[PDB]
Amino acid sequence: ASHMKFTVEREHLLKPLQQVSGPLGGRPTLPILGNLLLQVADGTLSLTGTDLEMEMVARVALVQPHEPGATTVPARKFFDICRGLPEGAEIAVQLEGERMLVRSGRSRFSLSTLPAADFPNLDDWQSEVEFTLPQATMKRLIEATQFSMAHQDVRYYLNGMLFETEGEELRTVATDGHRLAVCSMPIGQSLPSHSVIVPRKGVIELMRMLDGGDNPLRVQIGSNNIRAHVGDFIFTSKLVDGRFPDYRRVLPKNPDKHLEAGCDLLKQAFARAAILSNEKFRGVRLWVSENQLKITANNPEQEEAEEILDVTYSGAEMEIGFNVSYVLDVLNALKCENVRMMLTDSVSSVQIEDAASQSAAYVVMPMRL
């Protein structure tokens, strides 16, 4: 364990290195958080990156003679060296004193190290629920809602995504207090009930590990941590504390005005109107009348966009204002033929959803224009 050494084909290293460098990046703090932990033992090389809140581990099987041990090495420099070597290269790595040597061909790189003993670990924990699902289903759930997470709200429980198991369904919820997205998908297993908040940076990391086609995703949820296994990777994150809002109480109660329109026509009309909306406040005005929607936008310069669209609507006329970016985010996430908007009045939220599917639902709160 004192003299780590391994030799591995470049192509078995590149994707693991790229993946484990995900939690890394900006804001130097502890020096060793810019490093990857390398551990050789019993036929396996493990590579780990962490930002203290979450960690990503990749396992690479070692075919060739190796000696056990561990060290840490600058992540980006090690990846850039491996990637810069020619296709098919064999990469021989060994600790020499306080340096890590990387050799291939007549190329030699001697990298600085920091001790493996200094590499931070997440505290140990106990999984309460576990389930396995296709990557495509998790990717659905996250893409349907991720845009509605808050970024830096003082309501820190909003800077993340709720993952909820209920019956046979896995559900995601995201909201920033101005808009909410919820999506649920069947999992094919009866699950205990759990509701946990994954921090927004963990959502992004989870989601970048779903490159794999058909390798399934195994999820374990504890009281304070979540872990996802895909292929040879294991991702673990802390959870966020707090009582996340109940989407069931956020959905508009009995909206009485039901508008249906083509999703692409509606999206393009809002996108053009947005050009002449206020650059900061983004307000657009919707006027609904018999089978018609009018969208208007004005800015401090007194420029004005107006779009009129034929829609399906029978009901009282009303006017309502929205941040057009929030509406465009919903329409971009729907990707369907027809959308349904369900309205109540000018001061109340609206529900937006695919006219043909109820798997996802969106709620947007209006603006007083």
Partner: peptide, 5 residues
């Protein structure tokens, strides 16, 4: 802009 909660 109004809030949901």
């Amino acid at each position: 802009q109004a809030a949901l909660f």
